[PDB]
Write an enzyme that holds these catalytic residues in place. Structure first.
Site, PDB file in Angstrom:
ATOM      1  N   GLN F  32       0.810  -1.202   0.000  1.00  0.00           N
ATOM      2  CA  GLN F  32       0.000   0.000   0.000  1.00  0.00           C
ATOM      3  C   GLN F  32       0.849   1.259   0.000  1.00  0.00           C
ATOM      4  O   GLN F  32       0.345   2.330  -0.343  1.00  0.00           O
ATOM      5  CB  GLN F  32      -0.920  -0.010   1.216  1.00  0.00           C
ATOM      6  CG  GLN F  32      -1.862   1.160   1.320  1.00  0.00           C
ATOM      7  CD  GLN F  32      -2.727   1.071   2.540  1.00  0.00           C
ATOM      8  OE1 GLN F  32      -2.735   0.054   3.233  1.00  0.00           O
ATOM      9  NE2 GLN F  32      -3.443   2.141   2.835  1.00  0.00           N
ATOM     10  N   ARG F  34       2.817   1.923  -2.180  1.00  0.00           N
ATOM     11  CA  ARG F  34       2.694   2.330  -3.569  1.00  0.00           C
ATOM     12  C   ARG F  34       1.241   2.120  -3.980  1.00  0.00           C
ATOM     13  O   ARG F  34       0.750   0.986  -3.972  1.00  0.00           O
ATOM     14  CB  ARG F  34       3.646   1.530  -4.448  1.00  0.00           C
ATOM     15  CG  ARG F  34       3.691   2.017  -5.842  1.00  0.00           C
ATOM     16  CD  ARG F  34       4.412   3.325  -5.992  1.00  0.00           C
ATOM     17  NE  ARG F  34       5.863   3.205  -6.001  1.00  0.00           N
ATOM     18  CZ  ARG F  34       6.688   4.248  -6.075  1.00  0.00           C
ATOM     19  NH1 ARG F  34       6.203   5.476  -6.134  1.00  0.00           N
ATOM     20  NH2 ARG F  34       7.995   4.068  -6.093  1.00  0.00           N
ATOM     21  N   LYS F  38      -1.753  -2.933  -8.764  1.00  0.00           N
ATOM     22  CA  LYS F  38      -1.937  -3.292 -10.155  1.00  0.00           C
ATOM     23  C   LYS F  38      -1.734  -4.789 -10.299  1.00  0.00           C
ATOM     24  O   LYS F  38      -0.784  -5.332  -9.739  1.00  0.00           O
ATOM     25  CB  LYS F  38      -0.941  -2.495 -11.008  1.00  0.00           C
ATOM     26  CG  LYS F  38      -1.049  -2.673 -12.464  1.00  0.00           C
ATOM     27  CD  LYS F  38      -2.352  -2.178 -12.967  1.00  0.00           C
ATOM     28  CE  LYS F  38      -2.402  -2.285 -14.447  1.00  0.00           C
ATOM     29  NZ  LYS F  38      -3.767  -2.298 -14.951  1.00  0.00           N
ATOM     30  N   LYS F  62       8.180  -6.563  -9.794  1.00  0.00           N
ATOM     31  CA  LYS F  62       8.262  -6.337 -11.231  1.00  0.00           C
ATOM     32  C   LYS F  62       7.945  -4.891 -11.595  1.00  0.00           C
ATOM     33  O   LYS F  62       8.586  -4.320 -12.482  1.00  0.00           O
ATOM     34  CB  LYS F  62       7.334  -7.288 -11.984  1.00  0.00           C
ATOM     35  CG  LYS F  62       7.467  -7.139 -13.488  1.00  0.00           C
ATOM     36  CD  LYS F  62       6.448  -7.923 -14.287  1.00  0.00           C
ATOM     37  CE  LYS F  62       6.722  -9.402 -14.281  1.00  0.00           C
ATOM     38  NZ  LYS F  62       5.682 -10.098 -15.053  1.00  0.00           N
ATOM     39  N   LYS F  74      -3.106  -9.124  -7.167  1.00  0.00           N
ATOM     40  CA  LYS F  74      -3.477 -10.265  -7.984  1.00  0.00           C
ATOM     41  C   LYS F  74      -4.870 -10.706  -7.576  1.00  0.00           C
ATOM     42  O   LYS F  74      -5.232 -10.635  -6.406  1.00  0.00           O
ATOM     43  CB  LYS F  74      -2.467 -11.407  -7.827  1.00  0.00           C
ATOM     44  CG  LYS F  74      -2.720 -12.562  -8.731  1.00  0.00           C
ATOM     45  CD  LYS F  74      -2.635 -12.094 -10.169  1.00  0.00           C
ATOM     46  CE  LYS F  74      -2.891 -13.203 -11.141  1.00  0.00           C
ATOM     47  NZ  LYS F  74      -3.117 -12.632 -12.481  1.00  0.00           N
ATOM     48  N   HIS F 143     -12.668   5.383 -16.009  1.00  0.00           N
ATOM     49  CA  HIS F 143     -12.234   4.488 -17.075  1.00  0.00           C
ATOM     50  C   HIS F 143     -10.765   4.112 -16.959  1.00  0.00           C
ATOM     51  O   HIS F 143     -10.273   3.342 -17.783  1.00  0.00           O
ATOM     52  CB  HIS F 143     -12.538   5.076 -18.452  1.00  0.00           C
ATOM     53  CG  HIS F 143     -11.776   6.318 -18.796  1.00  0.00           C
ATOM     54  ND1 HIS F 143     -12.018   7.531 -18.197  1.00  0.00           N
ATOM     55  CD2 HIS F 143     -10.838   6.548 -19.744  1.00  0.00           C
ATOM     56  CE1 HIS F 143     -11.235   8.449 -18.735  1.00  0.00           C
ATOM     57  NE2 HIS F 143     -10.502   7.876 -19.670  1.00  0.00           N
ATOM     58  N   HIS F 157      -3.019   1.471 -28.064  1.00  0.00           N
ATOM     59  CA  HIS F 157      -2.422   0.855 -29.240  1.00  0.00           C
ATOM     60  C   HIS F 157      -1.017   0.374 -28.912  1.00  0.00           C
ATOM     61  O   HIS F 157      -0.252   1.072 -28.247  1.00  0.00           O
ATOM     62  CB  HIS F 157      -2.378   1.838 -30.409  1.00  0.00           C
ATOM     63  CG  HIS F 157      -3.726   2.245 -30.913  1.00  0.00           C
ATOM     64  ND1 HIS F 157      -4.444   3.284 -30.364  1.00  0.00           N
ATOM     65  CD2 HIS F 157      -4.489   1.747 -31.914  1.00  0.00           C
ATOM     66  CE1 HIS F 157      -5.592   3.405 -31.006  1.00  0.00           C
ATOM     67  NE2 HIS F 157      -5.640   2.487 -31.954  1.00  0.00           N
ATOM     68  N   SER F 161       1.467  -6.323 -28.846  1.00  0.00           N
ATOM     69  CA  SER F 161       2.875  -6.642 -29.003  1.00  0.00           C
ATOM     70  C   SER F 161       3.701  -6.323 -27.771  1.00  0.00           C
ATOM     71  O   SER F 161       4.881  -6.676 -27.743  1.00  0.00           O
ATOM     72  CB  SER F 161       3.455  -5.898 -30.202  1.00  0.00           C
ATOM     73  OG  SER F 161       2.904  -6.362 -31.411  1.00  0.00           O
ATOM     74  N   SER F 186       0.580  -1.358 -19.692  1.00  0.00           N
ATOM     75  CA  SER F 186      -0.623  -1.173 -18.883  1.00  0.00           C
ATOM     76  C   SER F 186      -0.547   0.123 -18.090  1.00  0.00           C
ATOM     77  O   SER F 186      -1.558   0.799 -17.891  1.00  0.00           O
ATOM     78  CB  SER F 186      -0.826  -2.347 -17.930  1.00  0.00           C
ATOM     79  OG  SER F 186       0.134  -2.319 -16.904  1.00  0.00           O
TER      80      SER F 186
END
Lengths: 294, 294, 294, 294, 294, 294
Positions: F32, F34, F38, F62, F74, F143, F157, F161, F186
Site C-alpha cells: 500500500q 505504492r 496493479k 516487477k 493479484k 475508465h 495501441h 505486441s 498497462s
C-alpha cells in the site's frame, strides 16, 4: 482549556447602494472530543476573536452541566445589524454560512449554530436553506444543521419559554446552570430534526388509550365488589388531566425533558458541593462539576 | 452458509523497545443481506481465519434468533495481549481499525465490532476515537461505529449484566439463545448512539406526571362517591413503584427491551418445536428458527 | 404550482426471447422546499410526463394535509406489466432505480418511492436491494430509500389496512384527506427504517410493568382503608386491556399514530371551514388548508 | 488584500519524557478565487497569526508574477524545532496535518503546503503519508497534497537548485520575481504528481529518434547532390547535443519550464514599466503586474 | 437514438423590479456510454424539450466524427435574454447551474456545458464560479466543469477562431464535420483545465534548445568537411521559423491539434465513401461514419 | 514481504439452466506504500489464496524494476471458464467487480486489474462498465479503473505486441525484467485514461511542422552560400522518416516509452551487478535492484 479550532474569515459583499464591503467573522470550536459543537452567532461591532473563544469554552462547560453531548462553539460577524437592510443581511448570513460550510465549521454532525439577541430565527432559516441547498442537499440530517428555526422549517415548540422556564425549574430545585434551558431545548430541537418526526406524534393516541384502559380497569375491579352497571365511576379522568390528554403536544414533551434535565443537573451540583463541601456557592460547584465531566 | 467477505491483514508496528513486528489480523463478514454486520474482536495466538469465519456465521444466526437486524462478523488479531504494553496495544488497535476502515470492514452502517474476553472497553474507545478522528469525522453516526464503549464515550447502562441477565430471562421463559443478551444490548447501544440521546431522557418526567394524574384521577372518582377532602388515598404509589419512578434511568429501559426480547424469542423457539414437534431439544429448534429467518 | 424537477428517461433492456427494447420512464419531483420527496411508481402504457407531474403536485398537497413532511413525487414507466415475465420486470425495475439514483431522483434523504396498483412489494425489494447494493452500500439509511417493502426487508405492520383504516378514521372524525392513510403509514415506515428498530421494541415491557404498578398501587391504597390481604382486587386489568398488553406490537403504534394523524387533520380542515366559512364542501377547505401550509 | 480564511489551532502532544504540551499553529489562505492555495510551513517560536497572514498575501502575488495558478497560503507552528526529538516532530507534524485536513486547509485541490528553512523533506513525507493514509486513501491525487517531497515519494528533480537557478535566469533576462523559482518548480512538482508520470518518460526516446531522422535526412539530401555512400556526414550530433540526448531526464524539462517561466515573467514586468513608465524600480512594476493579474 | 436523460426544470427568480418569475429550463444528455456529455446552453423563447433532445443527439454524432470522447448534451432556458438586466441573468444562470448540479447534469466528469450565440463567456464564468463555490469546492477538476471560459478563468487561446479555422482546415482537406472545430477546441480546453497547466508551458524552451542543437550540429558536420570557424552558417533558422520559436504559445498547439483533428476526420469520411462508395455526398458518409463509431 | 490486504469472497450466481452456484474469489494487495495496486485476474480451478498472494508480491517487485509506480496485486476466481456460457461469465465478472469495489479492492486510485490468459478484453469491458455504472459514475477517472480494455473503450495501441516487444528490447540491451513490457504498457494505458486524450493527439502536427521548418532552415542556410532558388534540396525527409511523420500515432509513443523503459531498467540492473559484482546472473541482480527501490 483553549479552543481546538478558530476560523477567522473575510468575505466581500455588495452593499445595497452598490458599495463594496469586506465582512469579518469568526467561529471558535472548543472541544472536538464532543461532537457536534454547538453555539450561537453574534452580530455586533464588539465581536472579537478572543470573545468568541471565551464564549465557546463557556458553552462547552454549560453543555456538560446539563448533559447535552455537544462541544462548545461560538461565532461572531463584525457588523452593526441596524446599518444593513434585510436584503444584505440575507447575503451576509448566506455567504458566511457558505464559508464556514466549506471549512467544516457548520454541519449537523459538525457544528450546529444557534441565534443570539442580535440573530433571529429568520437568520436560522437562511443558514438552514443555504446548507440544505448547497453542501447538504443529499444529507438526510441537513435540517439539523442549525437550531432556533421556525416551526414551519423544523423548529420546536416551547423554545420561546425555554430559558425563562429553565431558570424557574432550576430554582425550584434549590449562570452556568440556570441559563442552560435554551441549550437543553436546542438539543431537543436538534434531536427532533434528526428524528424527522415531532415528539409524541406516534405516542399520544397510544398513551391516551392506555390511560383509558387503566381507569376502565379500576371500575371493573371495584364493580366486581359491589354489584352495579357502570355505577361507580373510576372511569373518569380529573379536570387538569383530561385537558392534559386532549392537549398533549410536542411542547409537553419538551417541558418534561427540560424539567428532568434541570432536576438531574441540580442534584449533581448539590452532590458536587457534598463532596468538596463547598458552601452556598453553587458557582464553583457547577464548574467543578462541568470540568469533572469534560 | 459461507462468509461473503473475509479480510486478511498484515501491518507493521514498532515494538516498544524498538523492535519491528508484523501483526496479522482477520475480519469475516457473513451475510451482507443484513447490514450492518456485528461481531467481536479477539486477541489471541489461537485466532485463525477459519475460526473467525466460523464465529461470524454463528453470530448471524444468533442475531436472527433475537431479531437483532445485524449480519454476523468476527475479527481476530494474532497476538498474545499479555506480551504487549498498553502503549503498543493502542497502536495495534488503532492501526487495525484504520486498515479495516479503508476497506469497509468497520463503520456504523457497515460493520460494528464488539469486545471479547481478550478485548475491553478501552480498546473500544481507541477504535471509536480512531474512526471518529479519521474516516468518520463528518459522519454523524461515527460513535455508533463500535459498541461496548464506556458510558462517557457513548456506552450504555446495563451492559455489564446483559449476558448474565439474559441467561436468567431466557430460562425463566422456559447457547444460541441464552447467550444473546449481550448481542441484544449491543444492538440497544448502537441504537442509543444512532439516537444521540439516552433512553427515557425525554420520557421519564412525562410518564411520571402521567402516572400521578391517574392515581389522582382515581381519588376524585372515589371521592365523588363518599364525601371527603383528600380523605381516601388512592393518590399514593406503592413502595417498589415509587422507587421505580424516582430511580428510572436508561438501564431500566434496557432491562425491559432485553426481557421483551428474550421473552419473544423463547415463544418463537417453542413454536418452532410445535411445528416440527422436536422434543426437549431446543438447540435444533433455535437453529431451525434462525435459519428460517435468514 | 409546477414541478421543480422532472426526469425523463430511456434505457435499453434485453427482452426475454432476446429482443431489444427501449423503456421510457419519468419521475417528477414537485417541491424541493420539503425533502425528501415521496411518491409511487406506476407501470402502465397510459403514463405520460404530464400525468406524473399532475400526481406529484397532488402528492405534495396530500402530504401537507396530514403533516407528513415530504415533498410530492411521482414516477411512471411506460410498459404493460402483463406483457413481461417477472425476469425482465426485475431488470426494468432494477435499471430504472439505477438511472434515477445516479441523477438524485431516488434516495432516503432525496426521493422515497412507493408502490401503486401496478407496482408491488416485490418491486420495492428490488428497488431497495438495487440502491443498497450500489449507491447506498455505506449509507446507514439505505433501507429507507423506499417504502412499501415486505416486513422481512424492513416493511411495517399495518400497511395492508392503512388506507382502508384511514378512510374509516377520517369519517369517524366527521379524497385529499381520506386517502392519506397510506401516505401517513409510508411516513411511519420511512421513520421505522431511519430508526433501525421497530416501534415499541424497547417500550412494551416497560409500559406493561408501569401499568401493573399502577393497578397494584390502587390496591394498597384501597387496602390501607379496609383491612385485608390482597382481598380487594384492583390489581386485575380488564379483558380487552389484558389482550392489549399481551398483544402489543408495532401495528398498535402504527394504528394510533395514524388515528392521531387523521384526527388532527380533520380538526384543521374543520377550522379551515370555520375561517372562510365554507359550507359542507370539505374539498376546497382541504386544499385551502394544504396550500396554506405549503 | 486580506486573507479569506485563517485557521488557528491548538492540539495536545505527549512529550517524549511523558510531559504534556499544547501546540499552537496557524494556516492562512489568501485568495480562494485561485485554488489550490500554496505555501510553506514554518516551525519557529516567532510565528504569529499576522505573520502567516502577511506571508500568504505575498505568496498570492508571487504566484501571480510567474503565472503559477495557485492562491497564497502560509502555515506556522509555534515550536522551537531544536527542542524536540525527531520522534515528536513526527507527531506534531502528523497531527497538525490531520487537523488542517479535517478543516479543508490541506489537500491537492485545496491547499498544498511546502517546506521552509525550519521544515524539510522528511516533514513533507509525513504530511504526505498522513493525508494519503487517512483523508486521501482513495484520492488519486493524494500525493499532490504537498510539494517538496523526496524523489522516492513523488519529489521532483531540479528542486535543490530551483531557487538559485531562478535567481540566475531572472537576472540574465535583465524579491517577488527572483525568488519565484522555488514556487515555479513546486508547481511543476504538483503537476508531476497530478500527471502520475515523470516528465519526458514517454517523450525522450521518441524525440531522440526524431532528431536522428532529421540529421539522417540532411545527409541523403546533401548526398543526392554529390555522389557518395555515407561519405558526407551531417548524420552526427555535436558534443554538447549528444550528451543532451543520452542524458535527457526530468530535470532537463524542469530547467526549461523554469527558464521559460522566468523569461516570460521578466518581459511582462518590463512591459509593466513600459506602461506607467516606472524607472529602474522593478519592484513596484512587479507588484503593479501581480495585482493587475489578481 | 433517443436521449438517455432529459431534465426539465422550473425555478423561481425575483425580477429586478421585485416581480416574481418562474424560469423553465431543460438539459438532455444523449449517450451515457460516452462520459462526460458535452453541449451548449441556449437562452431563447424558442427552446423546447424536443429541440434540446434533437441537438443532444446531433452533438453525440458530431463529437464522434472528430474523435472527441464526449457524449452529446444540450440545454436551453426559456427566456428572452434581451428582457433581463445582467443582474438577473446572473441569478438565472447561477441558479440553473445549481439545479443541474444537484441532479448530476453538470460536472467535469458528468456534463460539460458550452456557450451558444445567446450565451457568452460571462455566463461560463458564472457557471464555473457557481460549481466551484458549492458542489465542486474540493474537486480538483471543478474548473473543467464548463468550457468557453475567459483566459483569466481557465479559458483557452485560439477559441475565437476555432470554428472559422476548422471550416477552413476541413475544406483544405477536400455541417457535421466542418462545424466540429469549436467542439474540438472545447475538448482541448477541457483537457487544459484537467491538465492544470497550459500547453507547451514546459515544452517550449526545451524544444527550442533542441532545434538549436540540430542546426548547430549540421554546421559542425559541414565544417568537418571544409575548414572554417563558424564560417558556413547552417546555424541560423529561417524567417518564419524564428518567429515560430520566439512566438510559440498555447494557441499554436491548439491550432495543430485542431488541424490534425480535421485532417484525420476527413480521411475517415473519405474512407467511409470508399467503402459504401457513396458519391460526392459527404453528409451521409459522415453520419455513416459517426454512427459506426457510436 | 507479506501482503497488506487479502480479500476472500463468496458470491452466488444463478447458473444458466437455473442451478445455484457459489463463486469463490480472492484479491491480494501487496504494498500500500505504492498506490494504486496493479495486477491481473485469473480464472482457474487452480487459483488459491497463497497463489494470488505469491503473485501480488512478484508484481510489486516487477513494477519496481521498470519504475512503474504501482503496488502489486493479484486476483483469482475459482471457476473453469470453459464450463460457463458467456452469459454467466458476464455475471460472475460483473458481480465480482461489484464486491471488490464496495471493499476498495478495485478503483483507479486504488487497484487497477488487468487480464490474464484466462481473462480477456471483454472481461475488462465488463469490469469497466460495472465500475463506471455504479461506484464510479461521477468519478472522472473511472475508465482508468482497469487496463487491457479495447481501443473503443479506452484501450491503448501497441498492447498486443507489448510483452513480445519488451522481451526483444530487454535483450537488445544486453523473467522479472523481460516480462515487464506488459506491465509497462498497462501503466501507459492507465496514464492515457487519466489523461483523457491519446498520446500525440495535440503534438503530431506541431512536431511535423517543426521538423519541416528545420530542413527548410538548412536549405536557406546552404543557399546563402551557393546562389540558387530551391536548387539544393535539404528540404526533403528520408524515406523511413517521411513514413514516420505521415504515420505517427499513439503506438509510436507507446513503443518509445516502452523502449526507454526497458533501456533504463537494463542499465540499472547492470549497475546492480557492478556494485555487488554478481556474475552473469541477472536474476538476483534484478531482485536486489527491485527490493532496493521498494
Amino acid at each position: 482549556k483553549p479552543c481546538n479550532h478558530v476560523l477567522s474569515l473575510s468575505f466581500p459583499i455588495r452593499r445595497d447602494d452598490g458599495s463594496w464591503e469586506v465582512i469579518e467573522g469568526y467561529r471558535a470550536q472548543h472541544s472536538q472530543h464532543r461532537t457536534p459543537c454547538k453555539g450561537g452567532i453574534r452580530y455586533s461591532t464588539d465581536v472579537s476573536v478572543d470573545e468568541v473563544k471565551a464564549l465557546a469554552s463557556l458553552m462547552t462547560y454549560k453543555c456538560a452541566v446539563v448533559d447535552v453531548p455537544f462541544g462548545g462553539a461560538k461565532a461572531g460577524v463584525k457588523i452593526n445589524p441596524k446599518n444593513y437592510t434585510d436584503n444584505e443581511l440575507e447575503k451576509i448570513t448566506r455567504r458566511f454560512t457558505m464559508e464556514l460550510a466549506k471549512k467544516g465549521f457548520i454541519g449537523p454532525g459538525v457544528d450546529v449554530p444557534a441565534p443570539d439577541m442580535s440573530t433571529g430565527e429568520r437568520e436560522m432559516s437562511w443558514i438552514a436553506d443555504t446548507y440544505a441547498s448547497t453542501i447538504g442537499h443529499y444529507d438526510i440530517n441537513a435540517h439539523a444543521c442549525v437550531t432556533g428555526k421556525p416551526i414551519s422549517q423544523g423548529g420546536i415548540h416551547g423554545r420561546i419559554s425555554a430559558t425563562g422556564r429553565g431558570v424557574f425549574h432550576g430554582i425550584e430545585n434549590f449562570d452556568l446552570y440556570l441559563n442552560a434551558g435554551g441549550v437543553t431545548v436546542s438539543y431537543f430541537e436538534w434531536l427532533k430534526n434528526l428524528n424527522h418526526v415531532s415528539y409524541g406524534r406516534l405516542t399520544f393516541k397510544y398513551e391516551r388509550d392506555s390511560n383509558y384502559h387503566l381507569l376502565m380497569s379500576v371500575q371493573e375491579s371495584l364493580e366486581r365488589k359491589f354489584g352495579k352497571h357502570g355505577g361507580t365511576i373510576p372511569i373518569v379522568p380529573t379536570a387538569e388531566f383530561q385537558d392534559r390528554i386532549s392537549g398533549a403536544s410536542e411542547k409537553d414533551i419538551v417541558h418534561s425533558g427540560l424539567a428532568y434535565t434541570m432536576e438531574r443537573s441540580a442534584r449533581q451540583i448539590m452532590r458536587t458541593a457534598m463532596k468538596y463541601n463547598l458552601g452556598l456557592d453553587l458557582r464553583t460547584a457547577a464548574y467543578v462539576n462541568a470540568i469533572e465531566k469534560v
